[PDB]
Ligand binder design. Structure first.
Ligand SMILES: Nc1ncnc2c1ncn2[C@@H]1O[C@H](COP(=O)(O)OP(=O)(O)O)[C@@H](O)[C@H]1O
Lengths: 481, 52
């Protein structure tokens, strides 16, 4: 039964996208809010099918009445909700399933004060007594943004979904859209896919009963603190976080799942932002968490570094078995020219370990990576040589010299000798920790391949999650070589 | 030991006949005149009759 619900939801939105190109993220987002009792905000230039989406969602229900209205600076509440005689509200707002209000950032004060009570309570003041409003979806579109200190900020804080629609950009999708014969005022949804009034009231009870896992809630446990330490981060109150749980629980209910999935957190990119400055910060902070702390991407990166550090520690401890012999050469030269090993070493940026560690540049080091292009000139011509510490930083100058037993001695500030050595040709402890970390990467990748088929997930976001998981698996495979 | 609560959201459509109780002389059983702890959320939006 729960698995068959994802087929009907995926088939319902397929018929609604007939005639609307590059609008898949706008139709699937309005469908989730219509079946859960939420709202959706649209922002963009006038002329991007912002009014057709308000008239297409009414076809999914058996008994749904649409309402299109443009809020003006001189508009009166008697034209939106209905004029009084006791109020003739036949076919307006109190008895409408889907209402559309274009340009909400310019209405009168009498309309804005009454619009805040029709969302939190879904009631209307019909003169004396009050009556419920069966509003299933509230969509509002405009073009500009409200002021930072005005009376229009109360309605913006209550709107959960805030989408930023724009014009088309693909050339192939523009030719089919420019020449479309599909009627926008017809009914392209079959009767078998239309939901009834009994199914809408039953789904509202099963949404709040969705189990909340502890591992999925760990993402919001850390992402909430990231939006508070940065001054450029938008202010997200507790009312916005409480309404985001209803949208996240309903996203997995219509996808054939019983619990909240970590992949449903991508919908927060259109709910926390509020202007053009917060758009580049919300989409960047979520992308880091979705490619870091989501599928244990960043959790395995910091754990892999401990295995590499442990492997280098065991290599420098057993360096007394393999030394470093430097062969000599004949010829006629004024200086004692030395030659390196032939086929024994062929890498350019090879690493050389050491026995007793020293303090170079007021810091410790365990391995010094030299360059094959500069080692041949120092062993023959002479002079000074450079080299970075711990394989990082700039190539600093060291006190390298030759020894009596054909070895390399590195001195510091206290004239301390240290014979260098090269790493030999995997210990049992390193292979044990590497096998356990590789098993966690395969288990985490299996969870992403079982929940990515959700309908409320954009298509361009799948290319970044797959590329991030492949980067972690490619770094662990290089250490076991 | 004997404390009666009263949780009512103060809305702009609220009337004095609902917060304190409707009249018949006023049915104020379990409202505001006979309550130990009263809670009124959002008080900056009530009417002039309730504020007075
Ligand atoms: N991006 C788009 N893709 C497909 N059709 C579109 C698009 N933008 C507009 N249209 C078509 O243009 C018609 C009129 O749209 P309109 O209601 O003026 O948009 P808006 O409400 O944004 O001004 C609609 O019937 C719709 O089919």
């Amino acid at each position: 039964h729960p698995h068959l619900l994802a087929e009907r939801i995926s088939r319902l939105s397929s018929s609604l996208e007939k005639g609307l190109y590059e609008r898949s993220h706008a139709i699937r987002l309005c469908l989730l809010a219509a079946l859960s009792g939420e709202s959706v905000f649209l922002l963009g230039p006038p002329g991007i099918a912002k009014s057709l989406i308000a008239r297409r969602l009414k076809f999914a229900f058996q008994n749904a009445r649409a309402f299109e209205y443009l809020m003006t600076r001189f508009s009166t509440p008697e034209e939106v909700f209905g004029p009084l005689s006791e109020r003739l509200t036949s076919g307006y707002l109190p008895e409408a399933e889907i209402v559309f209000l274009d340009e909400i950032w310019k209405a009168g004060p009498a309309i804005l004060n009454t619009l805040l009570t029709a969302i939190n309570e879904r009631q209307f003041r019909n003169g004396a007594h009050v009556e419920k409003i069966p509003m299933r979806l509230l969509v509002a579109a405009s073009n500009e943004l409200p002021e930072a200190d005005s009376s229009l900020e109360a309605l913006y804080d209550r709107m959960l979904i805030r989408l930023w629609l724009d014009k088309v950009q693909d050339k192939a999708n523009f030719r089919s859209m420019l020449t479309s014969q599909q009627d926008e005022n017809d009914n392209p949804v079959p009767d078998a896919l239309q939901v009834t009034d009994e199914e809408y009231e039953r789904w509202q009870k099963e949404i709040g009963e969705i189990t909340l896992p502890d591992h999925v809630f760990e993402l919001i446990f850390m992402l909430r603190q990231q939006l508070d330490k940065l001054p450029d981060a938008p202010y997200v109150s507790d009312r916005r976080w409480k309404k985001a749980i209803r949208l996240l629980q309903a996203s997995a209910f219509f996808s054939g799942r019983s619990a909240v999935a970590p992949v449903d957190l991508i919908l927060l990119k259109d709910c926390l932002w509020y202007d053009a400055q917060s758009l580049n910060l919300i989409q960047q902070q979520i992308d880091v968490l979705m490619t870091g702390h989501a599928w244990q991407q960043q959790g395995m990166l910091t754990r892999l570094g401990a295995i590499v550090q442990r492997h280098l520690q065991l290599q420098q401890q057993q360096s007394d078995k393999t030394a470093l012999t430097v062969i000599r050469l004949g010829g006629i030269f004024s200086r004692r020219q030395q030659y390196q090993l032939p086929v024994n070493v062929t890498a350019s940026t090879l690493t050389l370990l050491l026995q007793k560690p020293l303090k170079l540049h007021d810091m410790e080091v365990v391995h010094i990576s030299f360059e094959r292009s500069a080692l041949e000139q120092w062993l023959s011509k002479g002079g000074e040589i450079r080299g970075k510490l711990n394989g990082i930083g700039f190539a600093q100058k060291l006190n390298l010299e030759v020894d009596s037993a054909q070895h390399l001695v590195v001195r510091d500030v206290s004239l301390q000798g240290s014979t260098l050595a090269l790493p030999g040709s995997l210990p049992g402890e390193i292979k044990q920790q590497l096998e356990e970390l590789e098993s966690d990467w395969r288990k985490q990748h299996a969870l992403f391949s079982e929940q990515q088929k959700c309908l409320f997930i954009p298509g361009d976001w799948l290319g970044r999650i797959e590329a991030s998981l492949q980067d972690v698996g490619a770094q662990i495979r290089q250490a076991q070589q």
